Amino acid sequence: MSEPIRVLVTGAAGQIAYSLLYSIGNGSVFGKDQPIILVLLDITPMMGVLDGVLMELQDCALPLLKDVIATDKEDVAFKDLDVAILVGSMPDLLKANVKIFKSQGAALDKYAKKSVKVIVVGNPANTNCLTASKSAPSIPKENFSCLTRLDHNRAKAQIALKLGVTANDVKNVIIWGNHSSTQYPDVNHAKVKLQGKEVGVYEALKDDSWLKGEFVTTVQQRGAAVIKARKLSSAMSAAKAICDHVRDIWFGTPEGEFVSMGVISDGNSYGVPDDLLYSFPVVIKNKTWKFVEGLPINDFSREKMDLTAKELTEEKESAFEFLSS
Amino acid sequence: MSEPIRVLVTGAAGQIAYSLLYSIGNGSVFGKDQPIILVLLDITPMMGVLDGVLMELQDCALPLLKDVIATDKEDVAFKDLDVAILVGSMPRREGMERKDLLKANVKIFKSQGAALDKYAKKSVKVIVVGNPANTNCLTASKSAPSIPKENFSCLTRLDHNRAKAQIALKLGVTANDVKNVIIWGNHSSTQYPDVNHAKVKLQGKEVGVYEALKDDSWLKGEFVTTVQQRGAAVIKARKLSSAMSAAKAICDHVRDIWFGTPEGEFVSMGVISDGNSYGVPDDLLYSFPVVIKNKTWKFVEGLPINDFSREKMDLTAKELTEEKESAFEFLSS
């Protein structure tokens, strides 16, 4: 049994957290040998609901859940953290989110371990993540990431439906750019196992028009479609994606596979502006991600990558006007 | 890989099901080598919500989830089933008792028992969650005479896990170092959370719970009240029922059927009472301590029942007898 790690989930009385906490507490994210001190933060009006969530976690009788703490206070929530999963955001909008993530970045900067891994989920994910990182200069910028793994898994699922295979036989899809409707779901470098053999996804589909059109729109609009159907959030699949994202940080990516993660763009070789939080293909070893270098970018891909970079730059300049406050 | 099994969850557009489906689909219930055909039933105006759930299951990219079927029809939902998890029902709201829902929900379980009787495999395991769970389960079993009555069970594993959690708090250990708690009787306010046969690991030694705590009055009083009222406390706090923890308890209950109970441990399950040696009337669906192997449960025999425990077990048997008569009389009309 390893020494316990301290894991924060914010927005802890909300829908996504409610689908996530059991998977953290049962060992499925950080390993069956890894006890968890679970810290739950939400806003003061949600504290009565959060107490009910705490009761349910107790009632799960989880051996790895060494302690659970419910709080509305940043100095409790961010103390000595190994992992911070920032789910809560505002439901002007950007001004209110800058206030939240400047505050939480500042709390990370003074209360958490300097080795904390910070995974940002609450929308707008990339810009919230960038805001928090700029407000936490003593935390390595590489320790911040935002969730495009749900878009990634959605893309795998759409390819799997078109080909009649399970989504896990699809690998090396890429979500470039913003967790938004301008994201680029790219399969130029993806492979799928068909009848036992790996083949390129474009080769397997024989439908370039679909892959460059309807497939892209379907992934970009998938969250809106789930909300329209369920009237509630897309919490079950978002939680599973967070688990995948955090597990791959913690244990590394499989050999030959890369995954999508919003990370700081500094030094990228793909023509993306520096100082953005932008989703890239990454390989992960020893809890450290590295850009997949050397992927050729065709003209269709380059245009899509630039259009989502444009939106991220726009969000950054609008947000940072509110940064000094 | 084994051949796929077909697993039904009813009330599939609702909250408990939403907390449960991922655990079925990801292999944590039936095993990493067991592919699942997941069958989801709810009512007609909920099929749009269920379409959203199907999209989310797709988006989870689960390799053991071979297929997902969404339906509002019993002849689709109950066909060729290996496992039926009967969640769908009206929940209670703040301030209700679970027995307030008896006449609302037993009509549904009579219909679903009849559907099990003609459409499912005769080897189907039926796990009843919707309230009032014992009497709903008894009703379903009586409507499915061609399925062995031992294949029906109802969920007291959530009460069981709640009881472990309260003992763990009083003794300062993790809830999984508590074993052999028992929930006797009805999943209701007359349930008897019994720790006369429970053991706790304390400083590397196994000790009885009464011996470890040295507070008989708490174990016979506030402990019982806290476990009985826990479901209502969650509803008051969340304004919704306890879906995360109920789903986890369903997983525990079904996993122990599928793989068997751990060595030296027994678990609580509502089962048909016929032939019990604890003074419980026959022909009740009543929670007992059981051990399970080869997917077959057996009563734990020989546990001494003291005067306090006897009184509590008889009071909850009496309530179940009253519920049984209420359901029979209502359904006869």
JSON list of C-alpha atoms in Angstrom, two decimals, chain B residues 32-128:
[
{"chain": "B", "resi": 32, "resn": "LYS", "atom": "CA", "xyz": [-13.12, -8.62, -17.14]},
{"chain": "B", "resi": 33, "resn": "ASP", "atom": "CA", "xyz": [-13.74, -11.60, -19.46]},
{"chain": "B", "resi": 34, "resn": "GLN", "atom": "CA", "xyz": [-17.54, -11.31, -19.64]},
{"chain": "B", "resi": 35, "resn": "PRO", "atom": "CA", "xyz": [-19.04, -9.34, -22.54]},
{"chain": "B", "resi": 36, "resn": "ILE", "atom": "CA", "xyz": [-22.40, -7.74, -21.84]},
{"chain": "B", "resi": 37, "resn": "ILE", "atom": "CA", "xyz": [-25.50, -7.21, -23.94]},
{"chain": "B", "resi": 38, "resn": "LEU", "atom": "CA", "xyz": [-27.15, -4.43, -21.92]},
{"chain": "B", "resi": 39, "resn": "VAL", "atom": "CA", "xyz": [-30.94, -4.13, -22.16]},
{"chain": "B", "resi": 40, "resn": "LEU", "atom": "CA", "xyz": [-32.49, -0.87, -20.95]},
{"chain": "B", "resi": 41, "resn": "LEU", "atom": "CA", "xyz": [-36.22, -0.41, -20.26]},
{"chain": "B", "resi": 42, "resn": "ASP", "atom": "CA", "xyz": [-38.17, 2.72, -19.34]},
{"chain": "B", "resi": 43, "resn": "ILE", "atom": "CA", "xyz": [-41.51, 4.31, -20.19]},
{"chain": "B", "resi": 44, "resn": "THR", "atom": "CA", "xyz": [-42.39, 5.72, -23.62]},
{"chain": "B", "resi": 45, "resn": "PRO", "atom": "CA", "xyz": [-41.88, 9.47, -22.91]},
{"chain": "B", "resi": 46, "resn": "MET", "atom": "CA", "xyz": [-38.46, 8.65, -21.45]},
{"chain": "B", "resi": 47, "resn": "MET", "atom": "CA", "xyz": [-37.05, 7.09, -24.61]},
{"chain": "B", "resi": 48, "resn": "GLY", "atom": "CA", "xyz": [-35.44, 10.38, -25.63]},
{"chain": "B", "resi": 49, "resn": "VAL", "atom": "CA", "xyz": [-33.58, 10.46, -22.33]},
{"chain": "B", "resi": 50, "resn": "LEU", "atom": "CA", "xyz": [-32.59, 6.84, -22.83]},
{"chain": "B", "resi": 51, "resn": "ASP", "atom": "CA", "xyz": [-31.23, 7.73, -26.28]},
{"chain": "B", "resi": 52, "resn": "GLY", "atom": "CA", "xyz": [-28.99, 10.22, -24.50]},
{"chain": "B", "resi": 53, "resn": "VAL", "atom": "CA", "xyz": [-27.83, 7.48, -22.13]},
{"chain": "B", "resi": 54, "resn": "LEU", "atom": "CA", "xyz": [-27.07, 5.24, -25.12]},
{"chain": "B", "resi": 55, "resn": "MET", "atom": "CA", "xyz": [-24.98, 8.02, -26.65]},
{"chain": "B", "resi": 56, "resn": "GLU", "atom": "CA", "xyz": [-23.02, 8.38, -23.39]},
{"chain": "B", "resi": 57, "resn": "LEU", "atom": "CA", "xyz": [-22.39, 4.65, -23.18]},
{"chain": "B", "resi": 58, "resn": "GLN", "atom": "CA", "xyz": [-21.06, 4.77, -26.74]},
{"chain": "B", "resi": 59, "resn": "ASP", "atom": "CA", "xyz": [-18.87, 7.69, -25.72]},
{"chain": "B", "resi": 60, "resn": "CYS", "atom": "CA", "xyz": [-17.40, 5.65, -22.85]},
{"chain": "B", "resi": 61, "resn": "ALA", "atom": "CA", "xyz": [-15.72, 3.32, -25.41]},
{"chain": "B", "resi": 62, "resn": "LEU", "atom": "CA", "xyz": [-16.29, 0.17, -23.33]},
{"chain": "B", "resi": 63, "resn": "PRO", "atom": "CA", "xyz": [-14.86, -2.96, -25.01]},
{"chain": "B", "resi": 64, "resn": "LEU", "atom": "CA", "xyz": [-17.01, -5.42, -23.00]},
{"chain": "B", "resi": 65, "resn": "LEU", "atom": "CA", "xyz": [-20.23, -3.58, -23.93]},
{"chain": "B", "resi": 66, "resn": "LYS", "atom": "CA", "xyz": [-21.14, -5.62, -26.99]},
{"chain": "B", "resi": 67, "resn": "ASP", "atom": "CA", "xyz": [-24.48, -3.95, -27.54]},
{"chain": "B", "resi": 68, "resn": "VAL", "atom": "CA", "xyz": [-27.06, -1.72, -25.87]},
{"chain": "B", "resi": 69, "resn": "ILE", "atom": "CA", "xyz": [-30.80, -2.11, -26.49]},
{"chain": "B", "resi": 70, "resn": "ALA", "atom": "CA", "xyz": [-33.21, 0.66, -25.46]},
{"chain": "B", "resi": 71, "resn": "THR", "atom": "CA", "xyz": [-36.93, -0.13, -25.33]},
{"chain": "B", "resi": 72, "resn": "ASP", "atom": "CA", "xyz": [-40.29, 0.65, -23.73]},
{"chain": "B", "resi": 73, "resn": "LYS", "atom": "CA", "xyz": [-41.66, -2.86, -24.47]},
{"chain": "B", "resi": 74, "resn": "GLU", "atom": "CA", "xyz": [-41.63, -5.82, -22.09]},
{"chain": "B", "resi": 75, "resn": "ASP", "atom": "CA", "xyz": [-41.29, -8.35, -24.91]},
{"chain": "B", "resi": 76, "resn": "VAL", "atom": "CA", "xyz": [-38.00, -6.75, -25.96]},
{"chain": "B", "resi": 77, "resn": "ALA", "atom": "CA", "xyz": [-36.76, -5.94, -22.46]},
{"chain": "B", "resi": 78, "resn": "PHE", "atom": "CA", "xyz": [-37.18, -9.40, -20.92]},
{"chain": "B", "resi": 79, "resn": "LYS", "atom": "CA", "xyz": [-36.17, -11.65, -23.85]},
{"chain": "B", "resi": 80, "resn": "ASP", "atom": "CA", "xyz": [-33.50, -14.29, -23.13]},
{"chain": "B", "resi": 81, "resn": "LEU", "atom": "CA", "xyz": [-32.21, -12.52, -20.02]},
{"chain": "B", "resi": 82, "resn": "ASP", "atom": "CA", "xyz": [-29.45, -13.83, -17.77]},
{"chain": "B", "resi": 83, "resn": "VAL", "atom": "CA", "xyz": [-29.87, -11.02, -15.19]},
{"chain": "B", "resi": 84, "resn": "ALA", "atom": "CA", "xyz": [-32.74, -8.60, -14.54]},
{"chain": "B", "resi": 85, "resn": "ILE", "atom": "CA", "xyz": [-32.12, -5.59, -12.27]},
{"chain": "B", "resi": 86, "resn": "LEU", "atom": "CA", "xyz": [-35.56, -4.19, -11.50]},
{"chain": "B", "resi": 87, "resn": "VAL", "atom": "CA", "xyz": [-34.99, -0.56, -10.52]},
{"chain": "B", "resi": 88, "resn": "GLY", "atom": "CA", "xyz": [-37.87, 1.18, -12.24]},
{"chain": "B", "resi": 89, "resn": "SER", "atom": "CA", "xyz": [-40.50, 2.43, -9.85]},
{"chain": "B", "resi": 90, "resn": "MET", "atom": "CA", "xyz": [-41.71, 5.66, -8.36]},
{"chain": "B", "resi": 91, "resn": "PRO", "atom": "CA", "xyz": [-39.22, 6.87, -5.73]},
{"chain": "B", "resi": 92, "resn": "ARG", "atom": "CA", "xyz": [-40.20, 8.44, -2.51]},
{"chain": "B", "resi": 93, "resn": "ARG", "atom": "CA", "xyz": [-39.82, 12.14, -1.92]},
{"chain": "B", "resi": 94, "resn": "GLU", "atom": "CA", "xyz": [-38.83, 13.89, 1.29]},
{"chain": "B", "resi": 95, "resn": "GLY", "atom": "CA", "xyz": [-41.09, 12.90, 4.17]},
{"chain": "B", "resi": 96, "resn": "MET", "atom": "CA", "xyz": [-42.55, 9.70, 2.72]},
{"chain": "B", "resi": 97, "resn": "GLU", "atom": "CA", "xyz": [-42.22, 6.14, 3.92]},
{"chain": "B", "resi": 98, "resn": "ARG", "atom": "CA", "xyz": [-41.29, 3.45, 1.41]},
{"chain": "B", "resi": 99, "resn": "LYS", "atom": "CA", "xyz": [-44.59, 1.66, 2.15]},
{"chain": "B", "resi": 100, "resn": "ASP", "atom": "CA", "xyz": [-46.47, 4.70, 0.79]},
{"chain": "B", "resi": 101, "resn": "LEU", "atom": "CA", "xyz": [-45.33, 3.47, -2.64]},
{"chain": "B", "resi": 102, "resn": "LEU", "atom": "CA", "xyz": [-46.65, -0.09, -2.28]},
{"chain": "B", "resi": 103, "resn": "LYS", "atom": "CA", "xyz": [-49.84, 0.23, -4.30]},
{"chain": "B", "resi": 104, "resn": "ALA", "atom": "CA", "xyz": [-48.14, 2.48, -6.87]},
{"chain": "B", "resi": 105, "resn": "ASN", "atom": "CA", "xyz": [-45.34, 0.05, -7.65]},
{"chain": "B", "resi": 106, "resn": "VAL", "atom": "CA", "xyz": [-46.57, -3.51, -7.03]},
{"chain": "B", "resi": 107, "resn": "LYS", "atom": "CA", "xyz": [-48.77, -3.27, -10.12]},
{"chain": "B", "resi": 108, "resn": "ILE", "atom": "CA", "xyz": [-45.59, -2.79, -12.18]},
{"chain": "B", "resi": 109, "resn": "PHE", "atom": "CA", "xyz": [-43.82, -5.76, -10.61]},
{"chain": "B", "resi": 110, "resn": "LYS", "atom": "CA", "xyz": [-46.72, -8.11, -11.24]},
{"chain": "B", "resi": 111, "resn": "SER", "atom": "CA", "xyz": [-46.48, -7.17, -14.92]},
{"chain": "B", "resi": 112, "resn": "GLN", "atom": "CA", "xyz": [-42.71, -7.61, -14.95]},
{"chain": "B", "resi": 113, "resn": "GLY", "atom": "CA", "xyz": [-42.94, -10.95, -13.18]},
{"chain": "B", "resi": 114, "resn": "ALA", "atom": "CA", "xyz": [-45.32, -12.13, -15.89]},
{"chain": "B", "resi": 115, "resn": "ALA", "atom": "CA", "xyz": [-42.88, -10.91, -18.56]},
{"chain": "B", "resi": 116, "resn": "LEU", "atom": "CA", "xyz": [-40.01, -12.72, -16.88]},
{"chain": "B", "resi": 117, "resn": "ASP", "atom": "CA", "xyz": [-42.21, -15.83, -16.79]},
{"chain": "B", "resi": 118, "resn": "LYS", "atom": "CA", "xyz": [-42.56, -16.04, -20.56]},
{"chain": "B", "resi": 119, "resn": "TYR", "atom": "CA", "xyz": [-39.61, -14.20, -22.10]},
{"chain": "B", "resi": 120, "resn": "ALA", "atom": "CA", "xyz": [-36.51, -14.66, -19.91]},
{"chain": "B", "resi": 121, "resn": "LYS", "atom": "CA", "xyz": [-34.24, -17.67, -19.49]},
{"chain": "B", "resi": 122, "resn": "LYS", "atom": "CA", "xyz": [-35.48, -19.82, -16.66]},
{"chain": "B", "resi": 123, "resn": "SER", "atom": "CA", "xyz": [-32.01, -19.44, -15.11]},
{"chain": "B", "resi": 124, "resn": "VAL", "atom": "CA", "xyz": [-32.39, -15.64, -14.93]},
{"chain": "B", "resi": 125, "resn": "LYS", "atom": "CA", "xyz": [-31.28, -13.99, -11.68]},
{"chain": "B", "resi": 126, "resn": "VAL", "atom": "CA", "xyz": [-33.72, -11.24, -10.68]},
{"chain": "B", "resi": 127, "resn": "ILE", "atom": "CA", "xyz": [-32.53, -8.45, -8.34]},
{"chain": "B", "resi": 128, "resn": "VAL", "atom": "CA", "xyz": [-35.28, -6.10, -7.12]}
]
